[PDB]
Amino acid sequence: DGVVSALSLRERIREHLSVGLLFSGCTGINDKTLGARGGEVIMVTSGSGMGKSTFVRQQALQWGTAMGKKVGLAMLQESVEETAEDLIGLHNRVRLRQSDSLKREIIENGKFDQWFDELFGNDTFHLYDSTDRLLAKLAYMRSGLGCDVIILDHISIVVSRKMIDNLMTKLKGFAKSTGVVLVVICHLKNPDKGKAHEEGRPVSITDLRGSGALRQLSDTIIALERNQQGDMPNLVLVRILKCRFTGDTGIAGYMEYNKETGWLEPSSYSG
Amino acid sequence: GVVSALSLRERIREHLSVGLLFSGCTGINDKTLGARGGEVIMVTSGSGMGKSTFVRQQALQWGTAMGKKVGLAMLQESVEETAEDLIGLHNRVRLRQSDSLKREIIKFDQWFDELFGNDTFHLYDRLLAKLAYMRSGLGCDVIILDHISIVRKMIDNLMTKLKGFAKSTGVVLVVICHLKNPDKGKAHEEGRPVSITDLRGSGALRQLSDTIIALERNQQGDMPNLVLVRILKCRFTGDTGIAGYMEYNKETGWLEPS
Amino acid sequence: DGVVSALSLRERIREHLSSVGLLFSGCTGINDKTLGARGGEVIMVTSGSGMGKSTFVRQQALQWGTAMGKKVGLAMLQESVEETAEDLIGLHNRVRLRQSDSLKREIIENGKFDQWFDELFGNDTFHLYDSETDRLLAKLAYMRSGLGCDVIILDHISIVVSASGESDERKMIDNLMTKLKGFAKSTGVVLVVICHLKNPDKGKAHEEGRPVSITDLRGSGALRQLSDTIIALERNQMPNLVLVRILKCRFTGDTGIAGYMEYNKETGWLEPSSY
Amino acid sequence: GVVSALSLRERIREHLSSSVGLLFSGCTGINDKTLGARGGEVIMVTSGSGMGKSTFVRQQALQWGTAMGKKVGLAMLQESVEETAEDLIGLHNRVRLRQSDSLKREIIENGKFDQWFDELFGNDTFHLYDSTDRLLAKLAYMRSGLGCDVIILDHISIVVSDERKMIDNLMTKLKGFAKSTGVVLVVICHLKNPDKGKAHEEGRPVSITDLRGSGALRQLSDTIIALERNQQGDMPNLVLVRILKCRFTGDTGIAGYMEYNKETGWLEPSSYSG
Amino acid sequence: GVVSALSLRERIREHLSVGLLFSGCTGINDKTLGARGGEVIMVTSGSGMGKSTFVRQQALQWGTAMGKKVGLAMLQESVEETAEDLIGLHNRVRLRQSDSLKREIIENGKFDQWFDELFGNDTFHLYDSTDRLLAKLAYMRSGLGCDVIILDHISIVVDERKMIDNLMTKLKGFAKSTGVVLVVICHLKNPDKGKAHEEGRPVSITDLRGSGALRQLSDTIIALERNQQGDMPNLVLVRILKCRFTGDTGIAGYMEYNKETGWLEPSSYSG
Amino acid sequence: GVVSALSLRERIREHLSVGLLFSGCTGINDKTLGARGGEVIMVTSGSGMGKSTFVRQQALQWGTAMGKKVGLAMLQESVEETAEDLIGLHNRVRLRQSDSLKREIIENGKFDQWFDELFGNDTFHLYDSLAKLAYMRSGLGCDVIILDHISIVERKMIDNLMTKLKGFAKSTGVVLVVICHLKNPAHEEGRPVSITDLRGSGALRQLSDTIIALERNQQGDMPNLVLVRILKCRFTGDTGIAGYMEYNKETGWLEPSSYSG
DNA sequence: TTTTTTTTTTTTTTTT
Ligand SMILES: Cc1cn([C@H]2C[C@H](O)[C@@H](COP(=O)(O)OP(=O)(O)OP(=O)(O)O)O2)c(=O)[nH]c1=O
Ligand SMILES: Cc1cn([C@H]2C[C@H](O)[C@@H](COP(=O)(O)OP(=O)(O)OP(=O)(O)O)O2)c(=O)[nH]c1=O
Ligand SMILES: Cc1cn([C@H]2C[C@H](O)[C@@H](COP(=O)(O)OP(=O)(O)OP(=O)(O)O)O2)c(=O)[nH]c1=O
Ligand SMILES: Cc1cn([C@H]2C[C@H](O)[C@@H](COP(=O)(O)OP(=O)(O)OP(=O)(O)O)O2)c(=O)[nH]c1=O
Ligand SMILES: Cc1cn([C@H]2C[C@H](O)[C@@H](COP(=O)(O)OP(=O)(O)OP(=O)(O)O)O2)c(=O)[nH]c1=O
Ligand SMILES: [Mg+2]
Ligand SMILES: [Mg+2]
Ligand SMILES: [Mg+2]
Ligand SMILES: [Mg+2]
Ligand SMILES: [Mg+2]
């Protein structure tokens, strides 16, 4: 029997309480959800063309340089060279992959190796090269590397309803046991009336494909909106949908994109 | 049954002129008349409506004012977290969010032993054998089971087993499950009224229970701290519908009516 | 184990950012925003019915098989191999060969047929295809591996999701699309996809100049999530002034109205307009 | 099976001098921007409920059967076999046969019925079907077995009776039966209910997405012809022909006008200008 | 069984060797030419405008005056009510609206004077209350050998769009190649703006509620209109909406309702 | 299942062996003349405009005054509440609205002076609030059955319910009076309700043999003035105004009036 | 053989 009375728990609470990881850009988030904590499963939601991976790659950068924590990326959507070059271009403030005038410049100038060890000289970042296999690799990332942040790029091609229920229960048990700060990306569904999500429609908590337990086992959900064919396609609206630790949800802040650099930077906007 | 008018003279005379009670929005036990022995109680709402917080408040008010043994089954979190939340709820402090106070109080043992000087509560980290042990060797009068979605026919057999166990013992039992995904319109998190159809797994959950309580609030709205409570079923009374209103009282954490 | 650390990955990046392009034709704004087609992308071209979603594709296939020397493969499933190989001859020779009976017999008589056939198909560049979703991908691999095609065009994806009998069609489109994207990322071939648009709810039709949204892709929601460029064509039947909409650019961020084209009922080329 | 385009020197040649259109009747504005009807060319005809589809297609079947020598097979599902046969006889002899018991009793006693019958069905040009995968099997029995040049189907809404997947599979099968076989295939479908305003039978101009059953009917059809008239208005015999889709040429819009004959049943090209 | 045109040399000659005339108004018979074997006739109006009474009158006229066997399937009311209505409306009275007159006809033995004169030559068949309907109608048309089959209030028989569509397809297939006039009664949906169908709204063809299969499979469509709130609640208007044999639609004529004998007579009111 | 006309030799005479009247306003029996077996009477007004005030009054005048075995199936409340509603309505007092009178009537022995005069001869029946309404007719024998508040009792369900209740009325010899409501707009100011102001679907008016609408202008000059309008009558055809009735606030009753309108 | 969850396409039924 593993039943424990309330009296014989005095030390286990006293040792227990002896904020967490903050966000970068849209500074109303950590003002609202008080940042991520060890043992949380986070969902990032938008449509295609909104820049979910662009948002999460900045968080991968800022939690590996300023915080020094062991950050493990899981780019199931793309290759490791593309995300490595995007990290180099984001840290070095100048857009790398989306320009050809500089790709041949910085390789013959000799400062490629200068930019490489400036950000990968530590043992911080760990990439993944493309269910049971993925979870065994995450267990190796947790044991054999000591990762503190794990980012998972795309969950829909992980499924070739119950296969998402089993996956989300297994991921929640993994984050409960190991206590790793986890970010998991999923997409939105197709609405049947009115505008789509990509033209400035506010996203409700229903809009989760595949199954319905994506909102039942995750600890917080961040959504991003932006009128794509609009008067400005740069201003994003960030919306907290759920928070089990604080509870306060809604519209948090507003960011612009800064097309030369690529940094999601906060913008003042009354309404 | 078909009601005739032959043997119904002395019953109607009773119509002109309970057990454990519920705390907060007091038209619960004014309407369904509290908790009774041998019942199976369901509190089902949307994801994030405060099911666990409401049953945590009721587990507080059924263990101190009544003194009865309270056996929890919090298979969603750990035993220290729900204990810190109960200590902060008794001490009127949002504990697990106030980071400076957590190291300021460590009077910590003073607030611990004040509410745990008895052997009242019994937490938990097969499961029916554990519940039978909590019922026989410990004298529990309230048993709460928070998560049952991972614990059709695989849920129906478990519900038959729980209903037979409750009828055989005679203990107050509260079991929590979630709601299904609505198809058209808004969701339950934006003010949609919950019907008895919306229960995941199967349909025996409404046929083998005794009362169902639902909560609805506008989570993406102006007031995310104003629920509406709805009784959906009560085999003893029958009075269903709107019960009351609770605001969360952010500073403290007590669901208080207004 | 494939958990490659970020420090021991320099050389690969050394052979990555030195060794892109392959510009479109007919319009300039398509090459400004999307910056051409790349090895390993999926470019999707959408329209209504009879709106010219194959004419722009063949006008792009002629420029990418002759003016740049790339080997091009055509999985055309609407049209047989006898018509789409006959439209290209008159297009390069700037006429409408299929829509005219006189010019057909004129190039029969004087012997100009062999001259026009050898000027176009004198180089081993265009590899066609004629017409169950399992053998099509094997034929695409047979085109890419041995023959070595750079731009492969999958015309009319709706036939392999409709003639294939499935109870649930959404998972069929999702699984076909993710296996196709996996093939395109594995072999690194430029891939063009043609799909249709569904029935709208009310109002105008897409064949009457309705401004198309990204959510109107017919069949599933897996079409817009695993494509890298979405380009839409919109006219009003001036039944020849078509506008082009970049609905989703993964690589860059410039989306919106790209440009304007004009179709020629004398030659068959999509010239750019000026408005 | 993949092929290389340098082995195609003998087949593109053979296709180049093989392909000959069948000219429409009733309006010459149809033949100018469609150039007729070819092998492997699914032609859709639609109108409102009872607005003149079967009369038009039966006249087209008469003109393609007795004036151009083309063997024609029909699959009429609305009516009986003897009814459409007597309708063809009465329309070829320029009378109104079935709508008059007096002429039907008149021609059966003086023996001119056999004279009207042998001049049509002497050469054995028409073939009929006696009332869905067995349907295409019998159509291939008609085509590959006998050898008619134009196959007409009517009233496809019986054949599909989740309707959308069924009619999508049916439209793909009919397109595959038309293409790469060598037959013209004529298909008739209906319209759905409108949202607001006036009805399709009261003179509303029909759009392309009004084809009831799916939107998979307008993506696999080559030529789409829509007939529309006002049966309650001042001119209830002035049909308007609207070409909605044309894969071969691309010109869409109003072809012209046709005027139906209240006595002989021959809708003929009128000269009304709006 | 692909049959060529040569094999109909003897069949067409047998097919050349008949419209059943409508009663109540001769304006219907001029632009319909009656009804042949395999001729689906849809009869509609608003709610309570006399769809059952007009079809009951035609069931009377086609049975006792022309010798054609009529098989009714009245589902609005039961068997005894429509039998009393047929007897009272052949004897030109209002039978059910007079308690003393129902009681008198058994005291003087004249009940068999009105039963024998009508129901003796087997010229009628009834039906008491979807594939259990057609299986009995086929027995009504095969073994019994009736000539006009009548179906009342089709909404009892019926997502109710595929159901009414397959029903109308089965009824059309049962009518064709059998040789029977299949009278079918349907209804009309709600109006949207202005006045209602019970106040005399000019009905359109697309108001046949349930599907579009009620206006695309019927050979003849007859609609009735009556302003029961205006000046004359005894003057109905008859509108032919579809005729696949002749091709004339519009106002067929006016019929005057008589509030004494239960009959409606041909009226001569002009607009 | 096929019924010829030869086997109706005596069975039409079997139908010759009668309607059931109405009360309160005499304009109802003038143009409807009652209700036999197989008749459905839809009675409606706005949601809370006094449907049950007239329905239970007719059920009272049919049960204790004309001997007909009235059975209600009130599904808003249980057995005891509507039984005490029948008692307090028959004894002309506002029962469930004042604690003083309910306090005063329980002790002075005027309770069991009221049970044997109404509920003693087992006519009134109720439901334990398909397989039950057949036993309510066969074993019990009650005929005039009322079902209320169909919004708890949105197109397929109401059509299937109305079709099964239509089939329950037919071939039984039973009078099933069903109550429904109106769609939202103002209906509380005397707005003329046509037959199109139903809600749910249009399948209600297709099977309802008789349709009765109730109007009242509770916001004008005299709020206690109501009106009854027949909308659909399949037995006669005469539909329209029954007359005027006046309501009373202190006793809870209504009287037929003849105001000049 | 009997249930539950979930995604995308077309046709008719109703409302502030
Ligand atoms: C946030 C943002 C991104 N962008 C551009 C920059 C990048 O080129 C691109 C980033 O979007 P992606 O991150 O590539 O798209 P996604 O991950 O959200 O969607 P999916 O996985 O389904 O394909 O969008 C803008 O133009 N404006 C913006 O505000
Ligand atoms: C009711 C309410 C709760 N909250 C907080 C309290 C909790 O921390 C959180 C929601 O209550 P929880 O009880 O934690 O939600 P849950 O247990 O039902 O979630 P799950 O379905 O995954 O089991 O939000 C508010 O902030 N405002 C409110 O009005
Ligand atoms: C775009 C365009 C096409 N056309 C003509 C030329 C094209 O050959 C003809 C249609 O040919 P397609 O380009 O093949 O038509 P489509 O691809 O849009 O339709 P489907 O999906 O059925 O294949 O339209 C014009 O006349 N003007 C125009 O602007
Ligand atoms: C077009 C037209 C038809 N008519 C009449 C006479 C024709 O025989 C009749 C058309 O009969 P059909 O052509 O057989 O009917 P349809 O194809 O339009 O529709 P459906 O089969 O679905 O019912 O309409 C005219 O009188 N004038 C006209 O201009
Ligand atoms: C025909 C007609 C009937 N009436 C009266 C007497 C009829 O019995 C009554 C109509 O009853 P029904 O004929 O039964 O009404 P209905 O069949 O058109 O519609 P539903 O079955 O949906 O109710 O109205 C008139 O007042 N004027 C008339 O012109
Ligand atoms: Mg992405
Ligand atoms: Mg919980
Ligand atoms: Mg095309
Ligand atoms: Mg026809
Ligand atoms: Mg009727």
Amino acid at D62: L
Tokens of C256: 């919106």
Instruction: Indicate the DSSP class of residue B238.
Output: -
Q: Which residue is listed with tokens 């002076």?
A: F113
Nearest C-alpha in B relative to A13: B80
Q: Which CATH class is domain C1-275?
A: alpha beta
F46 Cβ contact list (under 8 Å, min separation 6): F181, F182, F187, F188
Residue (of C236, C234, C268, C262) closest to D252 by Cα position: C236
Atom of ligand 5 nearest to the CA of F205: 22
F96: burial class by Cβ within 10 Å (0-12, 13-18, 19+)? exposed
Query: Does E211 appear as a known binding residue?
Result: no
Instruction: Indicate the DSSP class of residue B192.
Output: P
- β-sheet bridge partners, residue F227: F215, F244
**Which residue out of A54, A155, A156 has the highest number of ligand 1 atoms within 8 Å of its CB and is therefore the one to mutate?**
A54
3-state SS of chain D? Answer: CCEECCCCCCHHHHHHCCCCCCCCCCCHHHHHCCCCCCCCEEEEEECCCCCCHHHHHHHHHHHHHHCCCCCEEEECCCCCHHHHHHHHHHHHCCCCCCCCHHHHHHHHHCCHHHHHHHHHCCCCCEEEECCCHHHHHHHHHHHHHHCCCEEEECCHHHCCCCHHHHHHHHHHHHHHHHCCCCCEEEEECCECCCCCCCCHHHCCCCCCCCECCCCCCCCCCCEEEEEECCCCCCCCCEEEEEEEEECCCCCCEEEEEEECCCCCCCCEECCCCC
If you measure CA to C1', which residue is closest to nucleotide G2? B153
Q: Determination method here?
A: cryo-EM
CA distance A214 to C200: 30
- Residues within 5 A (CB) of ion ligand 9: D 54, 78
Q: Say what the alpha-carbon torsion angle C104, C108, C111, C114 is, to the nearest 10 degrees.
A: 70
SS3 B83: helix
Residue list, ligand 5 pocket, CB within 6 Å: E 45, 47-53, 76, 226, 233-234, 236, 257; F 206, 234, 237
Question: Are the C-beta atoms of residues C256 and A229 closer than 8 Å to each other?
Answer: yes
Strand pairing of F210-216 and F39-44? parallel
C 123-152 residues with CB < 8 A to A = none
CB spacing of E216 vs D49 below 8 angstroms? yes
Residue (of E230, E204, E214) closest to E41 by Cα position: E214
CA distance A171 to A213: 12
F 65-84 residues with CB < 8 A to B = 78-81, 83-84
Compute φ and ψ for F201, nearest 5 degrees. Answer: -155, -175
Q: Which chains touch C (3 or more CB pairs under 8 A)?
A: A, D
Q: Choose the closest CB to B123 out of A4, A16, A18.
A: A4
Residue C56 Cα, ligand 3 centroid: separation in angstroms? Answer: 9
Question: Are the C-beta atoms of residues C250 and C265 closer than 8 Å to each other?
Answer: no
Tokens of D197: 């305003």
A95-to-A266, B54, C22, D41, E114 alpha-carbon distances in Å: 19, 51, 21, 52, 101
Compute φ and ψ for D63, nearest 5 degrees. Answer: -70, -30
Q: Choose the closest CB to E126 out of F5, F170, F202.
A: F5
Residue B189 Cα, ligand 7 centroid: separation in angstroms? Answer: 15
Give the distance from CA E177 to its chain's centroid: 20
3-state SS of B122-172? Answer: EEECCHHHHHHHHHHCCCEEEEEECCCCCCCHHHHHHHHHHHHHHHHHCCE
Resolution of the structure in the document, Å: 3.9
Crossing angle of helices C112-120 and C84-92, rounded to 10°: 90
Strand pairing of A250-256 and A265-266? antiparallel
D41 vs C: CB within 8 A: no
The superfamily (CATH) of domain F1-261 is P-loop containing nucleotide triphosphate hydrolases (3.40.50.300)
Q: Kindly report the nearest CA distance between residue E207 and chain D, in angstroms.
A: 10
**A127-164 per-residue burial string, b: 16 or more CB within 10 A, e: under 16:** bbeeeeebeebbeebbeeeebbbbbbbbbbbbbeeeeb
3-state SS of chain F? Answer: CEEECCCCCCHHHHHCCCCCCCCCCCHHHHHCCCCCCCEEEEEECCCCCCHHHHHHHHHHHHHCCCCCCCEECCCCCCHHHHHHHHHHHHCCCCCCCCHHHHHHHHHCCCCCCCCCCCCCCCCCECCCCCCCCCHHHHHHCCCEEEECCCCCCCCHHHHHHHHHHHHHHCCCCCEEEEECCCCCCCCCECCCCCCCCCCCCCCHHHHCCEEEEEEEECCCCCCCEEEEEEEEECCCCCCCEEEEEEEECCCCEEEEECCCC
Element (H, E) at E85: helix E79-88
Architecture in CATH for domain B1-258: 3-Layer(aba) Sandwich (3.40)
Between chain F and chain C, are at least 3 CB pairs below 8 A? no
F138-to-F39, F132, F142 alpha-carbon distances in Å: 18, 10, 8
Question: Are the C-beta atoms of residues B225 and B49 closer than 8 Å to each other?
Answer: no
CA distance A248 to B248: 11
CB spacing of F79 vs B4 below 8 angstroms? no
Strand pairing of C190-194 and C151-154? parallel
Instruction: Indicate the DSSP class of residue E120.
Output: S
Instruction: Indicate the DSSP class of residue B31.
Output: T
SS3 E182: strand
- β-sheet bridge partners, residue E184: E42, E151
The superfamily (CATH) of domain A1-271 is P-loop containing nucleotide triphosphate hydrolases (3.40.50.300)
Instruction: Indicate the DSSP class of residue A44.
Output: E
CA distance F23 to F54: 10
3-state SS of chain C? Answer: CCCCECCCCHHHHHCCCCCCCCCCCCCCHHHHHCCCCCCCCEEEEECCCCCCCCHHHHHHHHHCCCCCCCCEEEECCCCCCCCHHHHHHHHHCCCCCCCCHHHHHHHHHCCHHHHHHHHHCCCCCEEECCCCCHHHHHHHHHHHHHHCCCEEEECCCHHHHHCCCCCCCHHHHHHHHHHHHHHHHHHCCEEEEECCECCCCCCCCHHHCCCCCHHHECCCCCCCCCCCEEEEEECCCCCCEEEEEEEEECCCCCCEEEEEEEECCCCCCEEECCC
Atom of ligand 5 nearest to the CA of E53: 13
Residues in chain A followed by a break, C to N above 2.5 angstroms? 18, 130, 160
Amino acid at A237: L
C168: burial class by Cβ within 10 Å (0-12, 13-18, 19+)? exposed
The superfamily (CATH) of domain D1-274 is P-loop containing nucleotide triphosphate hydrolases (3.40.50.300)
CA distance C117 to D183: 29
Between chain B and chain F, are at least 3 CB pairs below 8 A? yes
Compute φ and ψ for D82, nearest 5 degrees. Answer: -70, -30
Q: How many CB atoms lie within 10 A of CB E177?
A: 12
Amino acid at E250: G
Element (H, E) at A225: strand A220-225
Crossing angle of helices B81-90 and B51-61, rounded to 10°: 60
Q: Which residue is listed with tokens 């590397």?
A: A145
Vertex E70, ends E68 and E73: CA angle to 5°?
170
How many secondary structure helices (H) and strands (E) does chain E include? Answer: 8, 10
Q: How many CB atoms lie within 10 A of CB A245?
A: 15
The residue whose CA is least distant from atom 2 of ligand 1 is A51
CA distance C249 to C229: 5
Compute φ and ψ for F202, nearest 5 degrees. Answer: -95, 5
Strand pairing of C229-234 and A40-45? unpaired
Question: Are the C-beta atoms of residues D41 and D178 closer than 8 Å to each other?
Answer: yes
Q: Sort out which chain D residues have CB atoms less than 8 A from C85's CB and list them.
A: 5, 8, 12
Strand pairing of D184-188 and D41-46? parallel
Q: Which chains touch B (3 or more CB pairs under 8 A)?
A: A, F
CA distance E148 to E183: 7
Tokens of A254: 């507003």
Element (H, E) at A224: strand A220-225
Ligand nearest to the CA of B48: 2
CB spacing of A206 vs B181 below 8 angstroms? yes
Strand pairing of D223-228 and D238-246? antiparallel
Question: Measured in angstroms, what separates residue C48's CA from nucleotide G9's C1'?
Answer: 16
Residue C225 Cα, ligand 6 centroid: separation in angstroms? Answer: 9
The length of chain D is 274
Give the distance from CA F225 to its chain's centroid: 20
Q: Which residue is listed with tokens 């990046």?
A: C13
CB spacing of C13 vs A123 below 8 angstroms? no
CB spacing of C85 vs D195 below 8 angstroms? no
Give the distance from CA D19 to its chain's centroid: 19
CA distance C113 to C86: 11
| E strands present in E23-166 | 39-44, 70-71, 124-127, 148-151
**How many CA atoms lie within 13 Å of B69's alpha carbon, on the beta-carbon side?**
15
A255 Cβ contact list (under 8 Å, min separation 6): A25, A26, A235, A236, A238, A264, A265, A266, A267
CA distance A73 to A60: 8
CB spacing of A191 vs C14 below 8 angstroms? no
Q: Kindly report the nearest CA distance between residue A43 and chain B, in angstroms.
A: 14
A 90-109 residues with CB < 8 A to C = 96-98, 100, 103-104, 106-107
Tokens of A140: 């190796």
Probe site for chain F from B16, B17, B196, B236 (most F CB atoms < 10 A) = B16
Query: Strand G positions with any atom < 7 Å from protein CB?
Result: 2-16
CA distance A88 to A112: 10
Amino acid at A41: V
Domains of chain A, by residue range, sit at: 1-271
Query: Does D54 appear as a known binding residue?
Result: yes
Question: Are the C-beta atoms of residues D94 and D103 closer than 8 Å to each other?
Answer: no
